[PDB]
């Protein structure tokens, strides 16, 4: 085994202490995820409820949910059936169980992405590096079929094929499509999905810390107020010196 390298720091808009997420990037990342990465991965913790008002307008989200068949039941006869998805349903998944997922992916298991940036070191910088990382093998190394070389994956050999391809998807705001752009936008989307409460958390943090610091100044003054009366005291032995 070896110590894997550390990724470079990219200037994502959010990684400042005063900045929020960047919602157009999040929309584009969601579009990428739907058109590409949802082929083999899952996000079992996400429901369409989460997108209205935070990322997308309600009407559009309902229309998105309507594109899927979702299973429900039992009915009066005790049978199961399929219906169009609704705002209350979780995202769909491509495989019914882990065994089928491994069967379709040569034995490896595609992890659920509901917390992916919180489940790796350097989070989004690691993911951004990983999506760039595919390269030809070095001299003296060969990989068995259905396995690929990536310079940022630990041990350098990974089961996921090269992920991105130019104009494999398209954007509704007009932005041009290329693997670098898709990388940035999908990493933004997944970082948001890892904890949608981020902006609430940070905006509350700011007020809290500011007020507490003002507090601290006031209490420091109050403490010194009492320090000074005994720090400046005079005690004499035998007879009085000064007055």
């Amino acid at each position: 085994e070896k110590e894997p390298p550390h990724p470079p720091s990219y200037p994502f808009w959010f990684k400042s202490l005063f900045h929020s997420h960047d919602i157009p990037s999040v929309r584009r990342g969601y579009e990428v995820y739907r058109k590409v990465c949802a082929t083999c991965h899952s996000m079992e913790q996400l429901h369409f409820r989460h997108l209205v008002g935070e990322v997308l307008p309600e009407k559009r989200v309902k229309q998105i949910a309507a594109e899927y068949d979702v299973t429900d039941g039992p009915n009066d006869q005790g049978e199961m059936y399929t219906r169009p998805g609704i705002l209350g349903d979780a995202f769909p998944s491509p495989y019914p169980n882990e065994e089928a997922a491994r069967y379709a992916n040569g034995g490896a298991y595609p992890p659920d992405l509901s917390l992916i940036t919180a489940a790796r070191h350097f989070g989004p910088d690691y993911l951004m590096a990983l999506l760039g990382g595919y390269r030809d093998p070095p001299e003296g190394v060969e990989l068995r079929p259905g396995l690929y070389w990536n310079v940022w994956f630990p041990g350098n050999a990974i089961a996921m094929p090269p992920p991105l391809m130019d104009e494999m998807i398209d954007y509704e705001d007009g932005t041009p499509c290329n693997i670098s752009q898709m990388s940035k936008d999908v990493v933004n989307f997944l970082t948001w999905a890892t904890e949608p409460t981020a902006d609430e958390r940070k905006l509350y943090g700011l007020k809290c810390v500011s007020a507490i610091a003002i507090g601290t100044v006031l209490m420091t003054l109050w403490w010194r107020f009492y320090w000074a009366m005994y720090a400046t005291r005079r005690i004499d032995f035998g007879k009085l010196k000064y007055l």
Binding site: E3, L17, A118, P154, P196, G205, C208, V209, G215, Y226
Partner: protein, 360 residues
């Protein structure tokens, strides 16, 4: 009980020169009370089932009002519990407090053991990879006795039964903590605190106006810092790998305990015999216990001044601290021969400098 309140926290008379280093006890108590509040309000929505514990913790964060805040305050205040305890211990190693505060020092050690147990039980409840495999390791470590491990587990392997009883135990232990704290303070105020100068003095001053305000000031700072780290996440205190669901047949490829457990981990990496491993912990704790009656180990009359200021010789406590920090460093890294070599050097230093405290 009001008259006692006044006798011990208002009219009680201290020494004039008690600086901030004597404020950290109050601080650990406050982190205890705070951790208890957040504990109880987390229990109202937690699920103790192996099939669904993980998603139970995720539900708080995703779908509950202010759900995220209590989980993160609870997670982050633990680090401050341990940091304050270590400062509080080192202060009294530095001063040789245990010279006359014998039973207080013993009580302290018992409280630290309680805290270790409480934290580790907590660490299993979110039920991720690190939780499962940590529980596996520590339960295998106390194997020497037949049938004790399947009994304490409840089962042949870490199970839902194990989760249920860990949850109940983690519920109960803190309050036993509180009782022992009352005992601690009894022994303390039986004697009276020491000075930083280690002399006996009549220049005393009452508590309520002067020292209460310093307590309050430090309390403000601590509340500040907890909220800073909790809301913005400046430091990666906890590793990401507890974010992955458990798998009983595959370990995580890289392993790093919570920081307050790394030194111990380092030992388990470098000593060859497993029993030697466990015996190092037992021996070091016994050595610390032995300091309670240091006055008896010699016939020279003892003083509390260790004359460590301006001293090129430094002191055994400082070497202990630096050895412990070095062990944390090595704890964090991968297993490799050179790390193990400097590990063994640091381990020998850590053991020897603890043994030597008795040799005045």
């Amino acid at each position: 009980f009001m008259s006692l309140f006044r006798a011990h926290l208002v009219f009680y008379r201290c020494a004039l020169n008690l600086n901030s280093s004597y404020n950290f006890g109050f601080l650990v108590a406050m982190t205890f009370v705070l951790q208890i509040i957040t504990g109880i309000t987390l229990a109202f929505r937690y699920t103790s089932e192996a099939s669904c514990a993980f998603a139970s913790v995720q539900h708080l964060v995703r779908e509950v009002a202010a759900g995220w805040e209590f989980r993160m305050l609870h997670a982050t205040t633990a680090s401050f519990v341990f940091l304050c305890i270590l400062i509080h211990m080192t202060r009294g190693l530095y001063n040789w407090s245990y010279s006359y505060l014998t039973t207080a020092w013993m009580s302290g050690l018992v409280l630290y053991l309680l805290t270790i147990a409480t934290a580790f039980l907590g660490y299993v409840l979110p039920w991720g990879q690190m939780s499962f495999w940590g529980a596996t390791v520590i339960t295998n470590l106390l194997s020497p006795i037949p049938y004790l491990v399947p009994w304490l587990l409840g089962g042949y392997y870490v199970s839902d039964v194990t989760l249920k009883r860990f949850f109940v135990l983690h519920f109960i232990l803190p309050f036993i903590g509180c009782i022992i704290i009352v005992l601690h303070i009894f022994y303390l105020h039986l004697n009276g605190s020491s000075n930083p100068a280690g002399i006996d003095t009549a220049l005393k001053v009452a508590f309520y106006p002067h020292m209460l305000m310093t307590d309050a000031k430090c309390l403000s700072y601590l509340i500040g810092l907890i909220f800073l780290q909790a809301a913005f996440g400046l430091m990666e205190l906890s590793h990401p790998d507890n974010s992955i669901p458990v798998n009983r047949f595959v370990t995580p490829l890289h392993i790093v305990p919570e920081w307050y457990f790394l030194a111990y981990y380092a030992v388990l990496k470098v000593i060859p015999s497993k029993t030697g491993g466990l015996l190092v912990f037992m021996s070091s704790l016994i050595n610390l216990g032995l300091l309670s009656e240091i006055r008896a180990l010699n016939t020279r009359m003892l003083i509390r001044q260790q004359f460590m200021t301006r001293n090129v010789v430094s002191g055994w406590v400082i070497i202990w601290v630096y050895s412990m920090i070095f062990l944390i460093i090595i704890g964090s890294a991968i297993p490799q021969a050179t790390y193990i070599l400097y590990g063994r050097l640091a381990t020998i230093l850590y053991l020897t400098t603890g043994l030597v405290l008795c040799l005045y």
